Scaffold this active site. Sequence first.
Site, mmCIF file in Angstrom:
data_model
loop_
_atom_site.group_PDB
_atom_site.id
_atom_site.type_symbol
_atom_site.label_atom_id
_atom_site.label_comp_id
_atom_site.label_asym_id
_atom_site.label_seq_id
_atom_site.Cartn_x
_atom_site.Cartn_y
_atom_site.Cartn_z
ATOM 1 N N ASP A 256 0.827 -1.197 0.000
ATOM 2 C CA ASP A 256 0.000 0.000 0.000
ATOM 3 C C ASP A 256 0.867 1.254 0.000
ATOM 4 O OD1 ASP A 256 -1.938 1.912 0.306
ATOM 5 O OD2 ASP A 256 -2.392 1.427 2.412
ATOM 6 N N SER B 275 -0.683 15.719 -11.932
ATOM 7 C CA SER B 275 -0.935 15.353 -13.310
ATOM 8 C C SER B 275 -1.190 16.609 -14.116
ATOM 9 C CB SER B 275 -2.145 14.411 -13.382
ATOM 10 O OG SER B 275 -2.567 14.177 -14.712
#
Length: 330
Positions: free
Chosen positions: A35, A199
């Site tokens: 994770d 992004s």
Amino acid sequence: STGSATTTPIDSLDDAYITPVQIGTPAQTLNLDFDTGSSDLWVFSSETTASEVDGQTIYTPSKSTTAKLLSGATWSISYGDGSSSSGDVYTDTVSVGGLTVTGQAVESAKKVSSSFTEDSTIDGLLGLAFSTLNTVSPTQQKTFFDNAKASLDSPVFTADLGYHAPGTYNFGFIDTTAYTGSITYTAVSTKQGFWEWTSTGYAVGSGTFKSTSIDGIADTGTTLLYLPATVVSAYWAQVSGAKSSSSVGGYVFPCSATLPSFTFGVGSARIVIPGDYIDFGPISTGSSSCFGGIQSSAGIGINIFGDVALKAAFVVFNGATTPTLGFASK
């Protein structure tokens, strides 16, 4: 040193991925959920409340000659999906894909929430976010990667998740045969303890690319792609009959649909998520309403590039002094 381990979807939907991890002496192999959005390595154990264990493999520290109680240390974690676990701590030898760390904090669960009990395939989590998020008190502990880092050939690990197929976690090297083209690197903020990046925009299907900054985290422990409501609405508007259902808990779409792809930007590069990756199947057995793999982050408080996004790429988690993230197509 290096390590290389295969990671395998837990079910037909790629809800999560498990990777075998050797703990203790002799080795006890548990299948852990790696994770990158948390920083605790915790396991089902001989100390876990018996009624909260249902099919998991447990770690038994008393059977490990290298286990030592970390005296006075406790831990307690709550995840974004509302699940939780807590307990005490041992140090022991932990190996992943041939890479060994001695003295790793192994957090033994005394209690786990229902979602963990109900998932017989996940024996615990191995956190790969920054150690500043580790919950051990009163002495915070380091992640497996942080402990391994100085011994690694290069201070990196990579995630290469498969779509309905196994993939690979590598430590200490970049497998140049595992991706196509070049890797594009992008800046990381560690201010919140995550692999947080920005992004450069998105496209829906064959549509034009929208240049827009989307801050979010690369999180292998989250199944879906969670993005701002504007972006998500633009995606689902291209699927006839798709709608947001408050009763179901997100966007659903007719199972008869053909889903468009979704592209996200990494610098001037583009990663394309095929439409099929965005299908999470019937909302309930036999239903013709299917659950979407791109959902709104509104009210999470952060955008999450989870498995839906990451599995479309070869992803480099670069843990050099100034960390960065790399993405390549594959």
